[PDB]
Amino acid sequence: HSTLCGRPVAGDRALIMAIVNRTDAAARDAVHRAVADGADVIDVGGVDVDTEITRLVPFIEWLRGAYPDQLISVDTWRAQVAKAACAAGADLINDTWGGVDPAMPEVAAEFGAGLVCAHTYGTTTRGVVDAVISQVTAAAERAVAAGVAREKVLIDPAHDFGKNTFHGLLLLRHVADLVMTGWPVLMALSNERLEGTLAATALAAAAGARMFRVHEVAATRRVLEMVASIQGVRPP
Amino acid sequence: AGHSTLCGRPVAGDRALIMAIVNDAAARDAVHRAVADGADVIDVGDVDTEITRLVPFIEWLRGAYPDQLISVDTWRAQVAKAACAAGADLINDTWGGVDPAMPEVAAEFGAGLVCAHTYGTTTRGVVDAVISQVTAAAERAVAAGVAREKVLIDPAHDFGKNTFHGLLLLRHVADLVMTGWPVLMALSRLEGTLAATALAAAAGARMFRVHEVAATRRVLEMVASIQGVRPPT
Secondary structure (H helix, E strand, O other): OEEEOOEEEOOOOOEEEEEEEOOOHHHHHHHHHHHHOOOOEEEEEOOOOHHHHHHHHHHHHHHHHHOOOOEEEEEOOOHHHHHHHHHHOOOEEEOOOOOOOOOHHHHHHHHOOEEEEEOOOOOOHHHHHHHHHHHHHHHHHHHHHHOOOHHHEEEEOOOOOOOOOHHHHHHHHOHHHHHOOOOOEEEOOOOOHHHHHHHHHHHHHHOOOOEEEEOOHHHHHHHHHHHHHHHHOOOO | OOOEEEOOEEEOOOOOEEEEEEOOHHHHHHHHHHHHOOOOEEEEOOHHHHHHHHHHHHHHHHHHOOOOEEEEEOOOHHHHHHHHHHOOOEEEEOOOOOOOOHHHHHHHHOOEEEEEOOOOOOHHHHHHHHHHHHHHHHHHHHHOOOOHHHEEEEOOOOOOOOOHHHHHHHHOHHHHHOOOOOEEEOOOOHHHHHHHHHHHHHOOOOEEEEOOHHHHHHHHHHHHHHOOOOOOO
16 A cells, blocks of 8 residues: 555555535545545535634544544645644645635645645647646645645646536546656546546546545546556456 | 448447447337437347348348448358348457358458457467457458458457456557557446446547447547547537
């Protein structure tokens, strides 16, 4: 098994980040299920800042209690929120917006937490990819120079785009290029629809994407296992 | 439109192809469901009893769907010959050329032919032997007069997606595709199959032999739209 952010993480396939939202027992169960199905990261998500803290903290606290070796990430764009979440036990900040809060890399640095760097004439269709690669690659370097450990930085070049928009599909076509930057690549492929999502997952995983943010852990795990088997089975 | 053509028949022009396996009433229904789901090919499958059952069905298929590519799943020339006479466009020789007259029957009718393949050597050795022997079988068909562009190679027939060789040939679909012959994929838990299908299609595999068309179709659609052959939805 590999380690991401000092936590045990699957070593024989791409990793799974499981989206878990509050609304309590259901949330607890959501975690239990994701772990059981092999989630490598539990990505905890949720109006206010004060109340948002009093929603994430006990949950992260509980999660860390139940699963001491589980890699926990927090889905927040606010530095104040990330601060208490890291203190509660979060290992990774998943800035789902991109860097609306300039103080965010500082927070990751202080707590020794990882950070997701996400991407929120004319020039060729190749340039569109290079324009993205450039912007996330700078986001990654700006985090590292702020004091975030290099290895704990992941890049999320195609965030929120979802299944079928031109930009989305292009970046999907060019995952290999994203991977070749040398930063671990996070994909957010989620949301009859699932066939296309799994196909994209497969392709992305085959091009070297490191992590996948999903709601359904098991379907994704089985795809990544198959990709891994196809690409890596060699003992006859 | 924008269809392209296989064996003279319209075929999805913007994704890899689907071959639907159909093996009386519930049989006709299976064809109806497959065609509606966008199956590009309907694989249909003593000689006398096999023929007298097969022929009328292919004559029905032809009449019910005049522009549908039809393949016959048989290993004997006699049965194949009777199937092509009924309307079959493609001989799906599922046993890899047990009957030596098979390519003669395909040539006679101007039918297409699937050159199928079904091993303690090296990893590269398997791939090379499979390629070697499907590639030589295809060239054998063209020598017998089968139209070059109506030949399909079936490198991994029945290989089993979860067996070691099945995974080996999946990893090397590119090598199969690189031979220049159109590659049919035909192996028999759902997400792994759809994963393999996704990977084979992006590597340029031409056709997929399946039982359930819809799910495979969606996978091929996505691959095609990722590679820019289909538009964004």
